[PDB]
Amino acid sequence: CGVGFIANLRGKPDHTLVEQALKALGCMEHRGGCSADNDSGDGAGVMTAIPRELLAQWFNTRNLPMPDGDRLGVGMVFLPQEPSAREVARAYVEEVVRLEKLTVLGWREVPVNSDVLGIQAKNNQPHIEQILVTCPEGCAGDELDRRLYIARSIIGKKLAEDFYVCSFSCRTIVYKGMVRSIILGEFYLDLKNPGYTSNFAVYHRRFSTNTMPKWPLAQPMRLLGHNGEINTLLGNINWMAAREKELEVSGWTKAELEALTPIVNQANSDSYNLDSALELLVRTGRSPLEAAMILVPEAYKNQPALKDYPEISDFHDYYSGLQEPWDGPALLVFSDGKIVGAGLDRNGLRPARYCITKDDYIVLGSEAGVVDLPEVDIVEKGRLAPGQMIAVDLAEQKILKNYQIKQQAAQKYPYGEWIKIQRQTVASDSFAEKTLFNDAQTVLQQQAAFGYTAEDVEMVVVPMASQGKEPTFCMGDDTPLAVLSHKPRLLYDYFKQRFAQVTNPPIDPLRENLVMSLAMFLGKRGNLLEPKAESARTIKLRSPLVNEVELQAIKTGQLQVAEVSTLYDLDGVNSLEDALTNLVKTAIATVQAGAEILVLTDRPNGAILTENQSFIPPLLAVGAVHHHLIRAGLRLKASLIVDTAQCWSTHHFACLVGYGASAICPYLALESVRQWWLDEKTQKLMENGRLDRIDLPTALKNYRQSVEAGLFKILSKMGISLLASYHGAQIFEAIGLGAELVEYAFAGTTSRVGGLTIADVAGEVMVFHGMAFKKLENFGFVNYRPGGEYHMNSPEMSKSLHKAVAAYDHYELYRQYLKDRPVTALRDLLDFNADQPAISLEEVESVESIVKRFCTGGMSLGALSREAHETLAIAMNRLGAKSNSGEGGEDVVRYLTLDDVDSEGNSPTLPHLHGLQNGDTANSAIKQIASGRFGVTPEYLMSGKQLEIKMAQGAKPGEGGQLPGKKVSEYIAMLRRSKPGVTLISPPPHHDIYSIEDLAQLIYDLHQINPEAQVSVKLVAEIGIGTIAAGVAKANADIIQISGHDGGTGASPLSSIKHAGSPWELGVTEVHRVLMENQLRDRVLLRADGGLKTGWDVVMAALMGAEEYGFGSIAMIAEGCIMARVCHTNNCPVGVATQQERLRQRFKGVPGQVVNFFYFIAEEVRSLLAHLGYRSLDDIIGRTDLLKVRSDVQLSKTQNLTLDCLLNLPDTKQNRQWLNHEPVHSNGPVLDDDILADPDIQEAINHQTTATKTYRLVNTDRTVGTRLSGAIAKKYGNNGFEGNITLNFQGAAGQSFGAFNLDGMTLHLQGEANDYVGKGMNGGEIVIVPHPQASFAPEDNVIIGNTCLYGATGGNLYANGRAGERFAVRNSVGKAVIEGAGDHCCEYMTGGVIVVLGPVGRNVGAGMTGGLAYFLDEVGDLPEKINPEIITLQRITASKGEEQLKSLITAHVEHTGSPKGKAILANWSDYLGKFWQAVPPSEKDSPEANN
Ligand SMILES: Cc1cc2nc3c(=O)[nH]c(=O)nc-3n(C[C@H](O)[C@H](O)[C@H](O)COP(=O)(O)O)c2cc1C
């Protein structure tokens, strides 16, 4: 979406501002989407003041007196088209208006031109009228809008696509519709009426994830226009709804508040709910600014900018206890008709740029280019940094800046005094060291009974306590889903973590930890509407993990505490179900008796579980009491603490909090740590072979630190900062839980496959009871064991495949390893139901044809040896299929076809490979673009047939790629332009992609540089992918990859491998269905991966809607992988997943073997087609009617699954045209096409001549220069061009100006630019300066946006002005001089040189591992703004450093004329001492940092 506002402070209200708003909307068209007719819009709208001059004509025609402005209520209403229905609706509106004691003056038919609408919107269009209203008692202004708000809320009980009030106010009105931006004013005649005047406008252009427009869903809403995505919505809704029955404020009756009723509803969009909640806050006595501060609070902790504003910190300190953030990316633009303003989310994940004139005229929007004001009278160009706001007081004619706004709200009450007196904090650095139990026999028995398994303590708890981090592992989750397993599992294992992809970004829990918090508040939640001292009475925790000391301190504390047992007797009468019934009833009664904290314990009275008792699993207990308290209207009366033996992993703590726990005492987990440390084997080891750097207090501290780190990780996967927001929210998908159970304890969680009843979960806990009543059982779970859990991959299976394939049987032995499998994946429950007789094999399409659909897929050159990586590429190219350069870039030597193969199959070009032939090429057909951008060079991008944007992989979907430092050889460091020994943890998000429109921008950038390459987007299966994928299709992607939770990895957290991501069957099927239903299916080819091994797997994936098939782990096995599962270790025995030269030499593996593998699978596909009676894969894709449930399958834990999710797909027997795709989608006409068509430019490219051209630019001119870069790179590579092209531009540049710039290209821009300037720049020069007529001091003003130089591998940028956040984010070799920046300057920088001649925001140098930066700090507060994890700050001492800085500023002055640079150079000696130099420990001994 695009959004913004314009305000005329000092001039008379006019039509010009309205025209400007419509033009601004037009400049934001690329930020919105269109319906299936490619004509109707997802939404465009404007909010303005009431057009009094226009409405006067209506009063005149009627000979009616017109009331004063603050006395005339106007309702803009969408009504039914059908006349009889329209009159029932009208009568209802009038009826409620009368009930508010208001008078209906009449109705105005709104003049429209329906013939400009797209066909779907035209079909959809409501009948649009305005109701005119007054108060005969004389109410006006605030009170009138209050009564209209009440009226709106009552009328809104009958919401329909057909019956909706857009606005009802005496100050504001909204004109909106399902239109493209330039259509809005052609549809509403009022908007082009010169009599329409307004002192402000809020405009919005919508991007939706569907193709079926509904008019009420355009924006603005009543108060707010919203760009972003709420990532905690289910939680935010649940908490707010729980407030509804108890609402109380001065100035309001109980009955009026009751009329507002459902403030929030999960049926409605995030935007609708936010508008509603925010208006409730406004209309009960806050400004919209204060409302937004409470609902979407700043990350106020560790904010140096708040040093002189203690009251602002106090405000948030207070509200932190009352209201969790409605988190996720957001630019909010809103108006009262009194104030108009804007604010960002805590992380500033949407852009907001603004402009102020000499007359205090102000323009703010998603992009800077957007209103043409005389450049000469602009007095400031600014932006909103994270959490910031800006506003206008219309009556006062005043612009209000960030901290002025917040201080005024904060000073209303003595928030801090209240906290001082009322709040209790519980925290303890010490643990209890005395053991709970004395017999290790007791400890072991309790462990067994509560579900601890040998690997649980050995592979999970012990590493957490001994290392202080959760464990890393490798390869995929090879095992049956918990519901399909014959092994006992925990209720936790049925819940998969949800995560962010495309529609909102993950955040970085390490680099941007400063923005996150695990703090929690215990006790009753106060009145949100009426601030009082009482509401600060709480117990604050710094962490949800409460140790024995902290638990006792809580039990004492100032709040009423009650213990509630989760145990019950096994008396042959009690069941888990009535124990649950009793639990819930007890909890309610206990809360009714005044308990403010409930401790749900499986150790009541401090007594141990016996053989005569069982327990309610803590996740079941907490979920049940959480939801039943909600149902009882008691949820805000108390907090829940889980005191449980069944909690030890990172995933456990997250599930517990996600479903209602404020805090957890994991008493058996702590006891497990104690007993491990106090084990003579451990004590004896420490005397030599384990780190005895660990006394008991350190082991315990390490354990807790591991859990806390793991919680930050899980939150960040979804982009969530505060545990308080995660607490209500239910950021999971359940797999294998029945509807009845889900409704009882996990209401609102999707669980698409049915499954477990309450009785089934009890049966499962009883398996562990029977094991408990010498050592814990080791099940198969992490690594294959002879009698353990089944793994799809194992060494023996692997060895028979490799020998079958090297032979030219071994394959039949391999084939039966697979068929003897227990049920493992969802597809295992299905079988074929043919609708046609079998045909003969000779009729079926050839193996050569089928193999074209196969992809090997992106395994990085760091994770794999070049031997294993290149071998795959040669094999896929021989096949006419595709391989993928995962996220480590690619060696340029591979771009060329092999010429020099001898008769033994060896090539001097790639001498480490074997079994080659002269036609061969190791070029990866698919080139990957991942968040780290390591590969990412113009030549690299031109070498791809296809380009893949990797949003997530199945093994670790919330997170970035991971390459252990030991595997970063000099070779890898060269490819990646990073530092040899250094661990690469890639950013979780693309800093390029914080929304669907930002993804559309990256796809545009890729189509720009390489218009012939298809662009794919790699997603991971989870509920919500369908919606996401519809967006991706609207964003002009050519392909969508769906990856299963299943897939391999060279290194990932073990928790992520086991707990995050869903089956591909669910993903492929959901995406296929959603695309077909939106009529978007023809727009994209669908590819699938995750545990694909076999022709049968391929046929199953085909039936579910996949057209292409990816293979990772299995392809590695074909090359000799023996499933050692030490990939993350660098010790691969077989030279596949290692960089060690001497292990690489062991690599046997020839392209011919993997060729043979794929022919085997394709032959299997042919036998299956013949059986089904079809000639071709093309005939069966999406034919889910050929699937049936297998009758020979009986599940261990439950009766059956529900598989409608897989079977109920749209009919595809007859309608198959969606299989026909356009070769590659176009960007449409682009300025670079005109540049490239110019004969002088063609001459400069082809003859390497000098050329210069000059052009006017506007914000809709995106990615300029980039198509020319691609053309040069295609011909000359990155460094071959000897020509010289200078392009001069004037105006406001759109997104991605100078992306992928190369040597020989000079881009000059006079004006300003939007985000991503020089994205992936490789060479040349970009120079950005203000207009000559600009009067402001350039160094004090924004000229460039966010994420500039992202992943740059070379080049120089000179900008005479300030940048936004993440300047030089992941810079590898770019150089730049700028005059100031927002937050996170140089964030993942590994090289190059950055000079900032002005103030910078906080979090400087987070993850900066190489390169140098120089910061001019004339204030003296820079040391407070550094991220101290890696870089050191020092004054310039080395003469080489001084000369490097001086040369760059001298260049900056020559290019720019920078007045600031000139002043520095004129007084060099005075300014030198005010610079700080940022030095990572790779640069400590460089001459420019040392000596
Ligand atoms: C060794 C290894 C390294 C991988 N590295 C990447 C990476 O560079 N980028 C990426 O998108 N996926 C990466 N993945 C995931 C694969 O692209 C693919 O999605 C996965 O292997 C498919 O599942 P499968 O192994 O069961 O066939 C890697 C997988 C493994 C096996």
Ligand SMILES: O=C(O)CCC(=O)C(=O)O
């Ligand atoms: O090589 C990289 O940087 C990422 C690869 C990765 O995370 C994986 O092996 O799954």
Ligand code: F3S
């Ligand atoms: S599992 Fe990994 S360590 Fe080697 S043998 Fe296979 S690549």
